[PDB]
Amino acid sequence: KGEELFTGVVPILVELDGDVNGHKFSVRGEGEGDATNGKLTLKLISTTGKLPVPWPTLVTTLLMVFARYPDHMKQHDFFKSAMPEGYVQERTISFEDDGYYKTRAEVKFEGDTLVNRIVLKGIDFKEDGNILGHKLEYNFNSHNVYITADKQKNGIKANFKIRHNVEDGGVQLADHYQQNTPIGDGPVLLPDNHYLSYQSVLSKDPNEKRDHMVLKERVTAAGITH
C-alpha cells in the first residue's frame, strides 16, 4: 500500500526549527521527489537571515522514503510502508572534537505533499571550531547508510559517519546515530540487512537573495544478494 503513493513525482515541504549554542534559526524548503528513480531536489531557504552553522552540516537532517528500492528488494522498504501516516526520524550527530546535534523529525503526508518537519538542537559547539566558524567547504561526499531492523520498536536503526571537507584541506567526521519509528500502528516492513547509497550535489540559485541551499540527492537501496 505505502509504496503506491510513490509511483509518480511527489511534492515535498521541509520545515526546520533550529537552535545551536542558543542561536535560533529557521529553514523552509520545497522540492520534488521521485522514488522510481531514487531522486529528489530541494531549495532550502533560511527565513531568519544568515545561518549560524554551515549548510553542509544540515544536509542529512533536511527523506529516505525517496530511495529507489530495486525490484528484488521491495519487501525491505520500511520507509514507504510507514506511509501515509509516517514515521519519526531521530538522530544524534556528534561532530569530531566539537559539539553535537539532536534532531527529531516527522515525515508524513499532509494532503498530497510529503512533509519533513524537524526540530534541531545543537549543544557544546566551539566558537572557533569548524561549524560556528564556518570553515567547511560547500560540497558533499557520497556515503553508504546501513539499515537494520529494530523489532522492539517496530522500526529501523542506522549509524554512519559523514565526512565533511574542511577549507584547509582536511576532513571532519560527523558521527550519526539514527532511529526511525512508525507514527501510526499499522503493519510495516521490517527489513533484512542492506544499505542505502547516497550521492549529493550542493548548489546555489543565482537569482535568490536569501541565504539558501539547493540540494540534489540520489539514493539507491543495495546489498541484498538476489
Residue numbers in the entry: 3 to 64, 68 to 231
Quoted passage from the original study:
We report the rational engineering of a remarkably stable yellow fluorescent protein (YFP), ‘hyperfolder YFP’ (hfYFP), that withstands chaotropic conditions that denature most biological structures within seconds, including superfolder green fluorescent protein (GFP). hfYFP contains no cysteines, is chloride insensitive and tolerates aldehyde and osmium tetroxide fixation better than common fluorescent proteins, enabling its use in expansion and electron microscopies. We solved the crystal structures of hfYFP (to 1.7-Å resolution), a monomeric variant, monomeric hyperfolder YFP (mhYFP) (1.6 Å), and a cysteine-free mGL variant called FOLD6 (1.2 Å), shedding light on structure–function relationships underpinning their brightness and stability. Through structure-guided engineering and screening based on GdnHCl unfolding kinetics and melting temperature (Tm) alongside rigorous spectroscopic characterization, we produced a series of avFP mutants demonstrating superior stability over sfGFP in diverse biochemical assays. Each FP crystallized as a monomer with no asymmetric unit.
Our structure-guided screening efforts produced a YFP, hfYFP, whose stability in notoriously chaotropic conditions, including OsO4, allowed it to survive CLEM sample preparation with fluorescence retention matching mEos4b’s. hfYFP also showed strong resistance to aldehyde fixatives and performed well in ExM. The spectral properties and performance of hfYFP in cells —having similar excitation/emission maxima but lacking eYFP’s 405-nm absorbance peak —make it an appealing replacement for eYFP. hfYFP exhibits faster chromophore maturation, fluorescence intensity in Escherichia coli equivalent to mGL’s and greater than the other GFPs/YFPs tested, 33% greater brightness than eYFP and 2.4-fold greater brightness than eGFP in three human cell lines, greater pH stability than eYFP and insensitivity to chloride. Intriguingly, instead of dimming, hfYFP grew 50% brighter in 6.3 M GdnHCl. The data provide further evidence that hfYFP is stabilized by GdnHCl even at concentrations that rapidly denature common FPs (and almost all known proteins). When measured after 12, 24 and 48 h, hfYFP fluorescence was unchanged relative to its value at 2 h. Whereas sfGFP denatured instantly in 7 M GdnHCl, hfYFP persisted >3 months in the same solution at room temperature (RT) (inset photograph). The melting temperature of hfYFP (Tm = 94.2 °C) was approximately 20 °C and 14 °C greater eYFP’s and eGFP’s values, respectively. hfYFP and mGL can tolerate higher temperatures for much greater lengths of time than the other FPs, including sfGFP. We tested the same FPs that we compared in the other stability assays and found that none could tolerate OsO4 concentrations used for CLEM except mEos4b, hfYFP and mhYFP.
